[PDB]
UniProtKB/Swiss-Prot annotation, chain A:
Protein name: Gasdermin-D, C-terminal
Record-marked site positions (Cleavage): L24, R25
S-(2-succinyl)cysteine found at: C13, C148
Domain of life assignment: Eukaryota
Region of the whole protein represented: 287 to 484 of 487
Chain segments annotated as coiled-coil in the UniProt record: none
Cell compartment(s), UniProt: Cytoplasm, Cytosol
Signal peptide from the UniProt entry: none
UniProtKB/Swiss-Prot annotation, chain C:
Subunit annotation: Heterotetramer that consists of two anti-parallel arranged heterodimers, each one formed by a 20 kDa (Caspase-4 subunit p20) and a 10 kDa (Caspase-4 subunit p10) subunit.
Protein name, UniProt field: Caspase-4 subunit p10
Gene that this sequence comes from: Casp4
UniProt effect for mutating L4K: Does not promote ability to cleave IL18
Residues that bear (Microbial infection) ADP-riboxanated arginine: R25
Included range, full protein: 286 to 373 of 373
Amino acid sequence: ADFQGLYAEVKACSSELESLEMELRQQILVNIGKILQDQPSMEALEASLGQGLCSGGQVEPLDGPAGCILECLVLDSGELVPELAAPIFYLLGALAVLSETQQQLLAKALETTVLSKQLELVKHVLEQSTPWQEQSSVSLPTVLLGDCWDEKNPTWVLLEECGLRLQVESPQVHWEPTSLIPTSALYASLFLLSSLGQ
Amino acid sequence: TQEIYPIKEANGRTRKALIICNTEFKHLSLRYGANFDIIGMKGLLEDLGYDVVVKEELTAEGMESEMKDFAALSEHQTSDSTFLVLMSHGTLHGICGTMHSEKTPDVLQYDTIYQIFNNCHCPGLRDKPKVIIVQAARGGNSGEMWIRESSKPQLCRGVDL
Amino acid sequence: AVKLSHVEKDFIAFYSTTPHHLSYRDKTGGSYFITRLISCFRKHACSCHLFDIFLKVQQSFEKASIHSQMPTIDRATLTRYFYLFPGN
């Protein structure tokens, strides 16, 4: 497996979301930011969506923001819309791989377009560190590091909490192969979150 | 008498209809099952009294020449209407020929068809209905989307309180 | 003898779908638009004029499906009702 298989898999999931109404994609995005501070709600929504995708039967409604997301993925008769529920289920699984700090930071970050910039940094880290199985260093364009690039920058904490060693001077990122699974999940998360605010 | 198009009696009538269908393309996907549309439309037009002319696997210039050939038929003088069935791949403003590609376009604009059959270039079909049926894509985008449904159940389509 | 006439008149077009959108076709039975057009014709040509037939075909596509189409009537310059009177 390589990054190209990851992109096509995540892009295909985000493709079916483009057919959703604009208000419903914003409702999903806002309410994901709400449940991102509530791990039990994310776990319950994963189980409901996973059960509905496997069984094809009625999905028992959930309460709170998790239910607001579920409203956007079910028919009137109660069954899941597979084209819509599966990418959201994919996004919830990737967020479950992230740390609590990364989840809290993403909840603050959905409100802006800085989310887009952050996505391409993680993408660049995955491409520039290929082959993934070797420790390596990555230089980043200053245009992507924002006005203030330090340990207090939110993007710094997102990459650092994935297990990447960060510093101010170039090269800024030390790729540790043990960080592959979480970093990939963050990439997939940032991709699907960005595709919803489009 | 004044609200309907006059219909000629089936006696000395020579109704003509045209079917143009492209199945195999050099660069475009094969239109599987296009023969079902050809046979179905030709049979229906025969049941409606039209002698059907069927032309297949044509370029844009081939389509243009066959349409001008169809419009110059003297049988339209003893006809009361005509049908034009076009089945192929399509673009936004035209229908694709056999050799069509995004780099090498082979497209007949639908506006060209109206020019061929209008009162200027087709005297045989003046004041007579000219029906054009187009089975072709008009773009590459999907035609459906997902939206919200009324929260209220099927019992209340329209209800006050 | 010389008479005045319009350049373009008595036209009607029935497209299988709306602009910018796809038109679908079944590998085992042909195009969906062509099939229901024939069915609506054989069912209603004896009593309905051409526009009503086209309008009933469009109604048959009203309910949205996963691969939806909405046939469109375009560049209609018909001045009267077009009854075919099948069988006469």
